[PDB]
Design a protein around this ligand. Structure first.
Ligand SMILES: Nc1nc2c(ncn2[C@@H]2O[C@H](COP(=O)(O)OP(=O)(O)OP(=O)(O)O)[C@@H](O)[C@H]2O)c(=O)[nH]1
Ligand SMILES: [Mg+2]
Ligand SMILES: [Mg+2]
Ligand SMILES: [Mg+2]
Ligand SMILES: [Mg+2]
Ligand SMILES: [Mg+2]
Ligand SMILES: [Mg+2]
Ligand SMILES: [Mg+2]
Ligand SMILES: [Mg+2]
Ligand SMILES: [Mg+2]
Ligand SMILES: [Mg+2]
Ligand SMILES: [Mg+2]
Ligand SMILES: [Mg+2]
Ligand SMILES: [Mg+2]
Ligand SMILES: [Mg+2]
Ligand SMILES: [Mg+2]
Ligand SMILES: [Mg+2]
Lengths: 139, 117, 176, 45, 41, 205, 26, 191, 97
RNA sequence: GCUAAACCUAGCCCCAAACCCCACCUUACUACCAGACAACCUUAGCCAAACCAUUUACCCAAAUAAAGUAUAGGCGAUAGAAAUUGAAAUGGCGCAAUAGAUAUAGUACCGCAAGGGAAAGAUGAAAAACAAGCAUAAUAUAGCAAGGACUA
RNA sequence: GCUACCUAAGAACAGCUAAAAGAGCACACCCGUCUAUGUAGCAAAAUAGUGGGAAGAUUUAUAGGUAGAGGCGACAAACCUA
RNA sequence: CCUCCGCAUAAGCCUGCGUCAGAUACUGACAAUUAACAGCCCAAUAUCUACAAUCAACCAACAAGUCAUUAUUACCCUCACUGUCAACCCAACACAGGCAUGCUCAUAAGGAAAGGUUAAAAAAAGUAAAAGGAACUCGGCAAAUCUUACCCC
């Protein structure tokens, strides 16, 4: 969970349990070639790799073999009309390696006007012989 | 020289970059030799329920009737949870009806709240 | 399985995906705590799928099919969170009389401003906490001048706003 | 020969003009108060 | 700017009209036109 | 020593749907009449108009046609909009911009009569006219470029009107030109039609 | 903008005079 | 929205709206009389009559209402003509485009008299709030699915499984799911 | 080019709005009301210059005396500086002496 | 005919009235360890005295008057009471984009820092419709460039 | 965060001659004797050549300290953000 | 043809020549840096620790120096978090300047002095020079050679 105060744990205390997870993750297509067993996620910045492993194993029953995370810096170079820098948000990227020889490949997602089209068909472009003379007149 | 950009862990020298974090909650401690001891109880355990056979869905049919919002109140909860038993026993020590004097001794204390979410 | 991060394969490529209505607070208030617990994860899986769809649409430079699904799911999750928070607040008020889940206190910081300092969890008492004792929760007399200056700045801003409002109102009355 | 008097180092920057040092003395507290009154986006360095 | 002059165009033209037949900037720029128009008069 | 003063840097950095379109026409002809049984459509227009006379319609059609062409003569787009359909107005007035036209009407040759009628709902009436008219189209510079202003010509036209079915009326929708129609009047000025432009690697063939 | 009406009126009159001189009516 | 944003015919978030009102524009604000929400009497779909301008007298149906500028768009009425699809070569197609009309320039129409009427928001015992025409009385009425695989049925959505109890969601779910925790939460210091 | 190319919007003045129509009424409150009220009591304005007049230095002194305690910090600082400057100007500068 | 020029409201000024989820003192915006250090203290000077050295008006708890009086003072520049008296209570002969707030903003930018600190916009009911400088048009013996003139 | 000096803990100094050197020649490195260029410059003090030191009182990265009726100074009244 | 360099670490900067689409290394969108390297440590109470380094052995020293533990009492959970890009930083600049360290000692790495033409003066730099060899000049400045002896401080 994020934006919440974690109950402080003292030695011998109970297990920390989160019942309504606040973490929402994205499964993103890798920008570079990755191993067949590697899945790329965009993660909230406050989520650990252990948290991500438990999240995937509990909510999705996905057998996870390894998790690696990195924080991607978002560009702060863009400037608005007032010359004030626009910050692209930073985000965490997690690489999850599936267990038991399982393989994953990002799915291939994404596999009046009539009047306008009919008039475009009926344009009747002016012929060169007409020499710019309007053709509407029947004479 | 950059005063406006946010101070992150990508900016200072090696010590600064190692020391500062990104808000991720701690999982354990560091012993001699910088060996990190991870405490299992510190790791949030996701209490994910069994969704098999569940009938609800992320969306609700538009055919559902409109209703008036009635935010739950302490009085309403007391009336709907305590008033029946109180009335029955009065017609016929508040702990018997559900009251708990001290939150201490509970796994889930209501104040100071000691559970996640 | 990872397939749950993506919509049904039949819906891939569809220009529009038919979706119901976001759960309302009143509708959720009738559900049991276990039912809300399960609905939370149902909505969480839906939200993850929709966020994946949005990111993939951005990557492919294509419009997201039925973007209002994400808004509906976010609204439903917010309503569920509000319902659970209302139940917790009612129970806390009944059993303790506290209107706030987290302890705190009104304190005057080093700048003389009154703030709601939210307490933090510590293992040692405050009088032994070196960093907490370093923190200062009082304002010395030299802050009074700046407090007055800030008050007068606020007063000037408010007076300007009210005067401008009256000028605009009179102009409107003259116009109409 | 001159001009490059600034030799950046975040340790020196924070230790010399940081929030902690400004609050460490009443004069620095008044500096922060002046910046707040002026409305500075960056109160400290 | 309680009281601001609004006739300066015509005040300038009163001299530039006499300066129109001079050579160079003396017929356009008032600073130069006024000196030469006074000499002309 | 006096240090140099930099000017501010900004001075040298400056740089240079619940509502839907309510159409009132169609993109052409529902059923093209081919020149050398419409009682269903006649009834379909009667039931919505409540007052109409096919026997008297051709006179109104001719009046609307002539008055619209006069409005073209005076470039009276305000009246032309009511006289002709929106599908027709661009054809009426686009190529005629920046040039004066001296269109005029003279006695018709044979009485105008309806041909066929078809049919959210748009009326449609095809009327055959065999009239006599005059043209003289000038340039921006007022020099004749088409037709004699005095000599009239015989014109056979198949004018199709359309109507909106609440406050709409019968307006020129489109003129049907049969493939067998005689070629129009020749133009005064000669024309050149360049051949296929040739890239260096390309050869004429 | 400078508050006033007399200078604007005078300038309008001069503009009218210049326009007439440049393109006198038939 | 940016301060003093000039509401136009295009919706406040469309591509055309962004093109017309980029973030840096500072045009003069448009003066609009302050008609209260309880006094607005024109609604989408209401039959109205145009009082001024071209097509004055003709009655149409309000298609859109830009409340922020006291505007009502009468479908197919008060129309100019604009070209759509005009490219480098094609002249485009003429289209009748409506222009917004002020509520002072437009008046409601009696449901049956089919004549302009002045209106009042008189309370009625049954229709707590409803319009009433003044010159001739009568109330002008206010004008105006298959579940998917991921849509809850109405009965399931309306089922009341909630039994009010003095248990938090956390402990209730713990009991339901059988999670057993014996460790006692040691007390912490708050400050 | 410092001249507007269009006539400014016409300025319509209602000479018979209530303010103008009733302007001056009760100016003779004193001599026509047994001197119960002085005409200066009809003056509405700053508390420190109701029925009183003086040059800038006197006005500033009166303002500081009468509402100085209620003035804002920087406004009071500016008033003190203005009084000081006006004292120096009127008591040490000028053509006549 | 180019560069341009033009605008009217964004706002501001003076008064009256009225009192006004999470993170963040460690390297701030950093979930989570043995404290302890805690604050108060005559303003000065410029300047006037034609130098300067004593001296030189300054939120004071009711306007007016006593009164610039009594007094003070290198008895000089200047400073200056009190007793006593006891009044009243709705906007603009303000600015209108070089003005009015610095403010579109304490932003951009400048400085290590404290700090300094800008500029600018103008269509419409609907966009879902005449400065300078030059060019047109380089130049003719000789001269503060014009005046008297002249058919020129 | 320059610079003067200092504190903590670091680092660099080829090769030859000599022998344990505030030694000699000479790289890197530090400096800046003279000439030329440059002078709104590549540069608000630079470039090329020439030259002084180059195992020492050397040079130097890092963090810290001394603050203006003061600091620091192998006194040049030098340096303390052109 | 040049190579002063170059590749990495540190410090600094913060997406700043990756892809796509548009304008005229710019704009918008999309992507990306994955820990083993590095940072981020240590349960207490006492108690311990004279004998440099220099191939550490002779030897020589002076300026006399960076490298250490025990005795009890506690103690098992164990791999979290953060840096990871670039043609880059300080000099207003895409500035001939400044920038610590390891390897490379001329390179396997990195680069281009000439936009095209002509070959006037004047100007800068460089090469060559008959005979002479400081006669120049304030002065052998500069250049070329590799050149003695002495005075003042
Ligand atoms: N002198 C002056 N009069 C003001 C000012 N603001 C408001 N007023 C006057 O206050 C009176 C009432 O103002 P309105 O806005 O008409 O009414 P309101 O809101 O009940 O007034 P308030 O109670 O003063 O807020 C009028 O006579 C105004 O002219 C101001 O700044 N100065
Ligand atoms: Mg990492
Ligand atoms: Mg340095
Ligand atoms: Mg003096
Ligand atoms: Mg301004
Ligand atoms: Mg001009
Ligand atoms: Mg050596
Ligand atoms: Mg030596
Ligand atoms: Mg000396
Ligand atoms: Mg000296
Ligand atoms: Mg080159
Ligand atoms: Mg060249
Ligand atoms: Mg020779
Ligand atoms: Mg000799
Ligand atoms: Mg000689
Ligand atoms: Mg000689
Ligand atoms: Mg020499």
């Amino acid at each position: 969970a994020r934006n919440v105060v974690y109950p402080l744990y003292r030695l011998g205390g109970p297990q920390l349990r989160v019942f309504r997870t606040n973490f929402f993750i994205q499964l993103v297509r890798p920008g570079v070639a990755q191993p067949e067993d590697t899945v790329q996620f965009r993660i909230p910045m406050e989520m650990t790799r252990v948290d991500l492993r438990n999240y995937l194993e509990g909510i999705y029953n996905v057998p996870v073999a390894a998790v690696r995370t990195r924080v991607q810096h978002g560009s702060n170079k863009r400037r608005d009309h007032r010359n004030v820098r626009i910050k692209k948000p930073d985000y965490k990227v997690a690489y999850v390696q599936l267990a038991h020889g399982q393989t994953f490949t990002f799915p291939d997602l994404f596999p009046l006007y009539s009047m306008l089209e009919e008039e475009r068909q009926q344009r009747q472009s002016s012929d060169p012989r007409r020499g710019g003379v309007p053709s509407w007149f029947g004479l | 020289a950059d005063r406006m950009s946010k101070w992150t862990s990508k900016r200072g020298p090696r010590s600064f970059r190692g020391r500062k974090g990104r808000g991720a909650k701690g999982i354990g401690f560091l012993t001699s030799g910088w060996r990190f001891v991870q405490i299992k109880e510190m790791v949030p355990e996701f209490v994910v329920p069994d969704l098999t056979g569940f009938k609800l869905k992320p969306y609700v049919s538009y055919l559902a009737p409109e209703s008036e919002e009635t935010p739950l109140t302490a009085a309403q909860l007391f009336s709907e949870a305590v008033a029946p038993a109180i009335e029955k026993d009065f017609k016929d020590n508040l702990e018997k009806y559900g009251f708990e004097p001290t939150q201490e001794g509970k796994l889930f204390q209501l104040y100071p709240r000691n559970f996640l979410r | 399985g990872l397939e749950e991060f993506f919509d049904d394969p039949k819906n891939w490529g569809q220009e529009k995906v038919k979706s119901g209505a976001a759960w309302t607070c009143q509708q959720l208030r009738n559900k049991s705590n276990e039912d809300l617990h399960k609905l939370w994860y149902v909505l969480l899986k839906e939200r993850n799928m929709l966020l994946t769809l949005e990111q993939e649409a951005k990557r492919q430079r294509l419009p997201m099919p039925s973007p209002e699904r994400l808004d509906k799911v976010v609204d439903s999750m917010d309503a569920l969170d509000k319902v659970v928070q209302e139940r917790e607040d009612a129970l806390r008020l009944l059993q303790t009389g506290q209107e706030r889940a987290r302890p705190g206190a009104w304190r005057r910081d080093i700048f003389g401003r009154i703030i709601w300092h939210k307490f933090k969890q510590w293992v040692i008492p405050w009088h032994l906490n070196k960093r907490y004792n370093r923190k200062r929760f009082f304002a010395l007399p030299y802050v009074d001048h700046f407090l007055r200056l800030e008050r007068e700045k606020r007063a000037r801003i408010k007076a300007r706003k009210e005067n401008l409002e009256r000028k605009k109102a009179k102009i409107l009355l003259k116009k109409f | 020969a001159r001009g490059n008097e600034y030799q950046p180092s975040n340790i020196k920057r924070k230790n010399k003009h940081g929030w902690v040092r400004r609050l460490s003395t009443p004069a620095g507290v008044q500096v922060i108060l002046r910046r707040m009154l002026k409305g500075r986006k960056s109160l400290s360095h | 700017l309680r009281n601001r002059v609004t006739d300066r165009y015509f005040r300038i033209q009163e001299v530039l009209k006499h300066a129109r037949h001079f050579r160079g900037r003396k017929n356009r720029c008032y600073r130069l036109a006024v000196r030469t128009v006074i000499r002309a008069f | 020593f006096t240090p140099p003063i930099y000017q501010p840097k900004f001075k040298t950095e400056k740089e240079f749907s619940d509502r839907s379109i309510h159409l009132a026409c169609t993109a052409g002809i529902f059923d093209a009449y081919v020149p050398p049984a419409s009682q269903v459509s006649i009834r379909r227009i009667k039931d919505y108009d409540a007052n109409f006379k096919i026997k008297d319609f051709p006179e109104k059609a001719k009046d609307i046609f002539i008055e619209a062409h006069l409005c073209l003569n005076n470039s009276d787009h305000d009246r032309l909009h009511t006289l002709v359909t929106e599908h027709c107005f661009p054809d009426m007035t686009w190529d005629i911009k920046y040039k004066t036209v001296r269109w005029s009407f003279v006695e018709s040759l044979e009485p105008s009569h309806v041909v066929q009628v078809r049919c959210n709902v748009y009326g449609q009436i095809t009327v055959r006219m065999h009239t006599r008219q005059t043209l003289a189209i000038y340039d921006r510079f007022g020099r004749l470029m088409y037709g004699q202003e005095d000599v009239p010509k015989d014109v056979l036209e198949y004018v199709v009107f359309e109507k909106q079915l609440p406050y709409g009326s019968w307006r020129m929708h489109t003129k049907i030109v049969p493939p067998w129609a005689p070629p129009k009047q020749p133009i005064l000025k000669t024309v050149m039609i360049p051949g296929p432009q040739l890239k260096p690697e390309e050869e004429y063939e | 903008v400078k508050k006033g009406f007399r200078a604007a009126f005078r300038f309008q009159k001069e503009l009218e005079r210049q326009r007439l001189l440049r393109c006198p009516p038939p | 929205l940016p301060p003093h944003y000039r509401y136009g015919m295009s919706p406040p978030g469309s591509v055309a709206d962004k093109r017309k009102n980029p973030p840096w524009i500072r045009r003069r604000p448009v003066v609009v009389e302050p008609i209260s929400d309880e006094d607005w009497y024109l609604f989408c779909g209401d039959t109205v009559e145009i009082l001024e301008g071209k097509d004055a007298g003709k009655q149409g149906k309000v298609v859109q209402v830009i409340r922020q500028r006291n505007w009502v768009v009468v479908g197919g009425l008060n129309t100019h003509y604009r070209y759509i699809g005009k490219t480098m070569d094609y002249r485009g197609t003429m289209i009748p485009s409506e222009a917004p009309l002020l509520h002072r320039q437009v008046k409601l129409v009696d449901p049956m008299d089919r004549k302009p009427t002045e209106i009042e928001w008189r309370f009625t015992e049954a229709g707590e709030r409803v319009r009433v025409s003044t010159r001739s009385g009568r109330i002008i009425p206010k004008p105006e699915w298959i579940d998917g695989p991921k849509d809850t049925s109405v009965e399931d959505a309306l089922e009341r499984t909630y039994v009010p109890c003095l248990k938090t969601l956390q402990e209730e779910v713990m009991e339901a799911m059988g999670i057993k925790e014996t460790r006692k939460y040691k007390k912490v210091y708050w400050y | 080019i410092g001249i507007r190319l269009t006539l400014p919007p016409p300025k319509v003045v209602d000479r018979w709005n209530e303010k103008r129509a009733m302007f001056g009424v009760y100016d003779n409150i004193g001599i026509l009301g047994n001197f119960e009220k002085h005409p200066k009591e009809l003056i509405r304005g700053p508390i420190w210059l109701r029925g009183w007049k003086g040059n800038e230095l006197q006005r500033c002194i009166r303002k500081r005396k009468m509402v100085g305690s209620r003035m804002f910090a920087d406004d009071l600082h500016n008033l003190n500086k203005r009084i000081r400057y006006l004292y120096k100007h009127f008591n040490r500068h000028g053509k006549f002496r």
